[PDB]
Design a protein around this ligand. Structure first.
Ligand SMILES: Cc1ccc2c(n1)SCc1cnn(-c3ccc(S(N)(=O)=O)cc3)c1-2
Ligand SMILES: [Zn+2]
Length: 257
């Protein structure tokens, strides 16, 4: 099965998922000088006040914080989007070292980690249908750098010991994802894909310019998670990121000058 090791990592994925070599794969390098301001883009609308978190799950690749997406409770709208996209889950990608971990890069700079808030277009009725459409998902990407702690991240960090291994989950209600956002909602946007198998080309990427800062202790706790199941030899969950893919026939747009 696919993963992030030498024998099953990103360079192997194309054998089971040929779209890995497609026309709109993610992540990409964001060349800041080549991205163009699009004055027609609208401010993002991030409406998370009624968000209902449910559960946190170690799925063997990352951990997902899952939300109730059976009503319009936490939605993303505006920006490059038409219509309403519901938050289904968030998760992170991160490195074994502070100098790597992000999936998108900025002028080839790698951040320590990257948060993905995953939303699906309500016109398609459910997430499974949405991923089959070119405008099915909107993923809000936020970079993490190591410095001061992020207070809004700590509740996530503290539950990780309870989901150390693949397949473990824990109740995770009443978590407010607003605490993971930076001050500014300035962003870059481009059409892309899921960054793990099945690599479907269904995502409008919205990547925030401003990173959030997390502490060395916070990211160290991410790196104590395991890819393996309980009762299996330990494989630390680190370096669960796909590298930058070719931009091909795409233009990255900026919401800001
Ligand atoms: C282990 C694992 C994780 C995720 C998925 C799957 N398996 S298989 C079914 C499915 C459908 N979408 N999707 C998803 C994949 C990637 C991103 S990201 N990283 O935000 O582009 C968001 C959602 C997954
Ligand atoms: Zn992701």
């Amino acid at each position: 099965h696919w993963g992030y090791g030498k024998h099953n990592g990103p360079e192997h994925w194309h054998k089971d998922f040929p779209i890995a070599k497609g026309e709109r794969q993610s992540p990409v390098d964001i060349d800041t000088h080549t991205a163009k301001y699009d004055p027609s883009l609208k401010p993002l609308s991030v409406s998370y006040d009624q968000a209902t978190s449910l559960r946190i799950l170690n799925n063997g690749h990352a951990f997902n914080v899952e939300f109730d997406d059976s009503q319009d409770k936490a939605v993303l709208k505006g920006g490059p989007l038409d219509g309403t996209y519901r938050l289904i889950q968030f998760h992170f990608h991160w490195g074994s070292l502070d100098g790597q971990g992000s999936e998108h890069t900025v002028d080839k700079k790698k951040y320590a980690a990257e948060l993905h808030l995953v939303h699906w277009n309500t016109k398609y009725g459910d997430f499974g249908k949405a991923v089959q459409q070119p405008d099915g998902l909107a993923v809000l990407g936020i970079f993490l750098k190591v410095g001061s702690a992020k207070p809004g991240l700590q509740k996530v960090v503290d539950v990780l010991d309870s989901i150390k291994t693949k397949g473990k989950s824990a109740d995770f209600t009443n978590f407010d994802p607003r605490g993971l956002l930076p001050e500014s909602l300035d962003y870059w946007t481009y059409p892309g894909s899921l960054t793990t198998p099945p690599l479907l080309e269904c995502v409008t990427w919205i990547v925030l310019k401003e990173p959030i800062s997390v502490s060395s202790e916070q990211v160290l706790k991410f790196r104590k998670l395991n890819f393996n199941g309980e009762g299996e030899p330990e494989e630390l969950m680190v370096d669960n990121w796909r590298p930058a893919q070719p931009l091909k026939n795409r233009q990255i747009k900026a919401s800001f000058k």
